Design a binder for this molecule. Structure first.
Ligand SMILES: [Cl-]
Ligand SMILES: [Cl-]
Ligand SMILES: [Zn+2]
Ligand SMILES: [Zn+2]
Lengths: 157, 157
């Protein structure tokens, strides 16, 4: 079958590698980014997936070479300030904890953590960086009234 | 089955109706919005769809009550300045022409028009407004070197 089913797709893969293009691009309000996913899940649903699993694939495709690059991608995406102590990850055994400051969807209040897409992204990116399969579970979230979101990172086989 | 398969989906439907929330939301650079679609089409592909057909559904869901509201949604989305003469649409027979100024993806150069998602959106929105089934075909595009994109609007049964 065809590598790319739509016209714009090869160009998007070039652009995500170009910080000047990202900085000059039009910015879309997050409610519309979410609406897209909502509309295409209605269409997925004769198949099925999750925002976490899509974030995993998204993360793979972003393919950051290191933690500093991971942090940079989150600023470029306007997804917030990712707090990761890399030297401690290297020194310690898992599970680890990482935090996100100034995340999207702060206008949302929910009892349960909301950032499933971001958690997937983090799992996917951490595999690209460190090789291991990771599972990332958000255990605290700004939308619960917390000041930062907190993610538990687990290495798995 | 469940109305909403993900946590954030009911909240997104409320937010798209709230201009204050849109204005205060985080803005995402368009290359990442496109990457999302690229990643979830790879996953769609054991099924199949198009950016045009998703735009149709997106348009339906936005459900603008009139042309002025359609124009406003495009500014809120940061998708550009939509040029539509409503009094002429009312007076004349189809097909019509509408234009878009300052669209996304101006860093893209392509021989063929690129704004398939926007063209779908327009078809879907025009059906919500006028009831008829519409087909919208982009016949000129900024990414061809033109100053504005141009869409042909056809009424169909
Ligand atoms: Cl937001
Ligand atoms: Cl853009
Ligand atoms: Zn969170
Ligand atoms: Zn165009």
């Amino acid at each position: 079958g065809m590598a790319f089913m739509e016209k714009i797709f090869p160009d998007i893969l070039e652009a995500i590698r170009n910080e000047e293009i990202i900085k000059e691009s039009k910015k879309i309000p997050m409610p519309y980014f979410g609406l897209f996913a909502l509309v295409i899940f209605d269409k997925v649903k004769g198949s099925e997936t999750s925002l976490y699993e899509i974030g995993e694939e998204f993360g793979k495709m972003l393919s950051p070479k290191n933690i500093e690059e991971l942090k940079k991608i989150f600023k470029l995406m306007n997804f917030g300030d990712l707090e990761i102590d890399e030297n401690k990850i290297l020194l310690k055994n898992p599970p680890y904890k990482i935090k996100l400051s100034n995340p999207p969807y702060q206008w949302v209040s929910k009892e349960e953590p909301i950032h499933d897409f971001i958690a997937g992204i983090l799992a996917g990116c951490l595999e690209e960086i460190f090789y291991y399969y990771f599972v990332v579970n958000e255990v605290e979230c700004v939308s619960q009234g917390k000041d930062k979101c907190v993610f538990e990172v687990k290495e798995v086989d």
